[PDB]
């Protein structure tokens, strides 16, 4: 019903009447349109989406690495602009937004031919020099070592790491072998249709307390074959039933009649169950995930993600006290829109149904010939008993009553006071997220405070998405994958520490919050004596270069 | 025929997808027009 | 949006012409500029807005 | 419609290109391919040449629809306002033009 | 007639002889009193984000094409400096370059 | 085009010149943008093919 | 009017058998509950959002 | 609150200016270290405390 008010489709549509107007001003749609851009802009006004900061002094290196890896994935592996647009509009229109977080991996095997080497420890002095060149290059420039160092030397270095001995590497020949070539291996996020997900009603308004959540989605046989061993009992599906037409409860944009003939690319509806179950039958609850298609189980296993909880995130627009879902502004504007439409249609019915451009003449003023002259644009003569200046009627539109205009104004004003959204006003609140109060013409007014409150809930949701992905990156990304993204030393995290985010804080990065930080280093650099320590001065200077998007200069300062 | 793949596509198969997606595409073009 | 016409101004044929958007001729004893009623919203009393 | 160059080497014909994923090896993996046909004859069939490995098309929405591919122009919201504005403007012209002067 | 024009302006956010100055502050911090964007500019900036993203995607596609379809001498002629190459297996991931409109 | 890490500065400088050169000479930049924006505004969505 | 001077306070809440088993030795006489009665329908005084 | 935090930071700056910087290095470092904590720079605060 809320959506039928935004788009006039359901009970909001005026009834069809012949000879009368059917227009309907889009009061609810207008109010929402001024909200979309004010909320989307903070998340898109910078080249960096996520900001990660250390909690303690030893956490600085880990935060720097995770900030680059997390931002890289949203820059390349996902359409950031399209996601945010769907993210905000889902929250504003439906009243609540649900986002599913997952991981996509497409490992595949490949056979190639690789060399084989023999190791000899006896070597000349130059060989010892040659080995130390690679070792220094590997630490100083991981990418440079990978790209422009001979394969034989790499094997000697690899043997050095495990054993600690410096040996030759002599090319003895080539041999064939099979390896897995990575594909995809990136996180996925998407907005869920609220009709397609069911959450435990007894959650008492908190998602972390729900005992189960069930999500419906479309899938293909090829997609199920990406993880070969994950899915069992796959041959029992007919690949003809369980189509979207055969599953009327799944709300999808796919056309009803659409169906690809190729069985490998057919689309079927699958259900996933995420919840807690007493798998050992002793009283303890464990997180599990189950998947079935058409009354056949195809997957049943423990929760793979390190977080150990449901991968769904819920965002309320206007929170209801101690309740899970949210309330959109379309709830409050239902009656104002209807009355506004009735008033507007009344004015149109008054003008449209009246005569206009019709000429009326009294019988007996003009004789048979003078009447023809008047109607043909010529001069004429009239009987003096009747006055043409007032007896000839030229019909025109009736005058609008003042009450019609007054009544419409009250509906607009009442709508503005409740929702707090005003046409051609607001929208400047994104310049002061996480910033101290500005001067006279920079401070937020009452309307901005209401709009800042909604931005807090949206910002919290992206923080929860970032924290989920950071945990995923710690188990699903190999060492070399992270080193390629960030050309520096790999910093690891213990597996038992994934459940607690001890080290990293995740927040969205606005451009001001970035310039404000840069000013803080400048103040500290001025405050501290520059001669007290060169390392302190360089470290402060290096961080400023990173804010100003000058990575090459930052590298020079750090290693000067 | 035209390629060495063991599951080489047929032209009818290619056009079959075109016919399947056509009714959905036509509806959108009505709004665009 | 309701139109009201007095009986006897327009004859059987001129009445059809008026209702069909054409020009017409009327009996001079009755003035169309004021005898044809075009109904509209009543004016709101000032006391309603003040209260 | 009537335009047609007589020179066969420079004639204009309509061609169709298919970009998508197909199980070329018949084992379950999908590969990007491109196919081209003119007048019910295949003239090209090969793997995707571009390094990106995906469709070479880019879609830009004006006003994005929730969880939908296409977009919404501002002409959608202004349909009824334009029609009523035209009726009012024509009413004034009909009042001046049809009167004696 | 006035109501129809005003209702149209409120929905779309476009006003005759107004706006158009939002292109001076793309990717820039908020300016002074008479430089900051108002509500109408925010709506128009949002559309510019989608257009700018599309050109970014076009640029990234072409950069990948230039790595395989241009010979060494062709690039050296355009840029009178040493040629820098990129490994073929790294074309699928844009590790090194960010593309944005200038 | 901007580098992501410190060693990427040289590659970004080269690709910026090559990419801008192609749009300056091998394509009509003004005409493309005019068709690019007007297609999005009028049709509601814009589709561009790269080859 | 002061909570620190109140002699007692009683609170009603929903719970599960698994939650009661988190603290194994804290709760006694657990086997005497039928786990069928005392449902929210059977306790009309408890106001809950559970259907 | 964020102001109550910036207001505190200004107080250390006033005290640092008021007290002679050469009266004691430990006092100066301790004041400087606390300012770094307010500005959310834990790494710099650790350096000052152990300098």
Curated annotation (Swiss-Prot), chain D:
Organism domain of life: Viruses
Record-annotated membrane-spanning stretches: none
Signal sequence coordinates: none
Localization, UniProt: Virion
Subunit structure: Homododecamer.
Reported function: Forms the portal vertex of the capsid. This portal plays critical roles in head assembly, genome packaging, neck/tail attachment, and genome ejection. The portal protein multimerizes as a single ring-shaped homododecamer arranged around a central channel.
Protein name, entry field: Probable portal protein
Curated annotation (Swiss-Prot), chain F:
Subunit structure: Homododecamer.
Purpose: Forms the portal vertex of the capsid. This portal plays critical roles in head assembly, genome packaging, neck/tail attachment, and genome ejection. The portal protein multimerizes as a single ring-shaped homododecamer arranged around a central channel.
Record's protein name: Probable portal protein
Localization: Virion
Organism, as annotated: Enterobacteria phage N4 (Bacteriophage N4)
Residues of the full protein shown: 103 to 153 of 763
Highest taxon of source: Viruses
Disulphide bond pairs: none
């Amino acid at each position: 019903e809320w959506n039928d008010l935004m788009r006039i489709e359901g009970k909001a549509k005026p009834p069809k009447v012949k000879g009368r107007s059917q227009v309907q001003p889009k009061l609810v749609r207008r109010q929402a349109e001024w909200r979309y851009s004010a909320l989307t802009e903070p998340f898109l006004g910078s080249n960096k989406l996520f900001k990660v900061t250390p909690v303690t002094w030893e956490d600085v290196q880990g935060a720097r690495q995770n900030e680059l890896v997390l931002n890289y994935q949203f820059r390349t592996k996902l359409n950031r602009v399209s996601f945010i647009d769907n993210y905000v509009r889902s929250v504003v229109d439906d009243g609540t937004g649900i986002v599913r977080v997952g991981w996509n991996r497409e490992i595949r095997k490949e056979k190639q031919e690789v060399p084989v080497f023999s190791l000899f420890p006896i070597q000349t002095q130059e060989q010892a020099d040659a080995l130390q060149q690679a070792l220094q290059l590997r630490t100083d420039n991981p990418r440079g070592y990978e790209e422009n160092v001979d394969e034989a030397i790499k094997e000697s270095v690899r043997f050095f790491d495990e054993t600690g001995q410096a040996t030759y590497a002599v090319q003895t020949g080539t041999t064939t072998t099979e390896v897995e070539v990575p594909l995809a291996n990136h996180p996925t996020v998407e907005m869920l249709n609220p009709e397609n997900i069911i959450i435990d009603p007894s959650c008492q308004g908190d998602i972390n307390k729900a005992m189960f959540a069930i999500v419906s989605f479309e899938t293909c046989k090829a997609d199920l074959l990406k993880e070969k061993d994950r899915y069992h009992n796959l041959n029992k599906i007919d690949w003809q039933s369980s189509a979207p037409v055969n599953e009327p409860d799944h709300a999808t944009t796919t056309p009803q009649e659409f169906q690809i003939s190729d069985p490998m690319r057919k689309r079927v509806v699958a259900y996933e169950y995420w919840g807690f179950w007493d798998i050992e039958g002793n009283g303890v609850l464990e997180p599990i995930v189950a998947t079935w298609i058409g009354s056949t189980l195809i997957r049943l296993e423990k929760n793979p993600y390190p977080d150990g909880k449901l991968p769904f995130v819920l965002i309320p627009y206007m929170p209801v006290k101690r309740d899970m879902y949210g309330e959109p502004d379309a709830e409050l504007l239902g009656d104002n829109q209807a009355v506004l439409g009735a008033v507007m249609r009344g004015m149109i019915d008054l003008l449209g149904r009246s005569a206009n451009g019709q000429r009326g003449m009294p019988k007996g003023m003009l004789d048979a010939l003078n009447s023809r002259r008047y109607r043909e644009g010529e001069d004429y003569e009239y009987n003096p008993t009747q006055n043409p200046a007032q007896m000839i009627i030229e019909h025109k539109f009736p005058e609008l009553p003042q009450s019609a205009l007054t009544m419409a104004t009250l509906q607009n004003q009442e709508a503005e006071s409740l929702t707090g959204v005003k046409a051609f006003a607001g929208g400047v609140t994104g310049e002061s997220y996480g910033d101290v109060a500005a001067g006279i013409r920079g401070v937020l007014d009452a309307a901005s405070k209401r709009e800042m409150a909604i931005l807090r809930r949206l910002a919290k949701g992206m923080s929860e998405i970032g924290n989920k992905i950071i945990a995923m990156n710690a188990v699903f990304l190999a060492e070399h994958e992270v080193v390629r993204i960030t050309n520096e030393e790999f910093v690891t995290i213990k597996r038992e520490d994934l459940k607690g985010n001890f080290d990293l804080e995740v927040d969205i990065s606005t451009a001001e919050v970035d310039n404000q930080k840069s000013q803080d280093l400048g103040f500290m650099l001025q405050t501290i004596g520059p001669n007290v320590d060169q390392q302190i001065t360089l470290n402060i200077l290096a961080e400023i270069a990173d804010l100003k998007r000058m990575p090459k200069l930052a590298h020079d300062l750090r290693t000067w | 025929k035209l390629t060495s793949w063991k599951n080489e596509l047929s032209l009818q198969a290619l056009k079959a997808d075109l016919d399947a997606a056509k009714p959905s595409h036509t509806a959108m073009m009505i709004k665009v027009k």
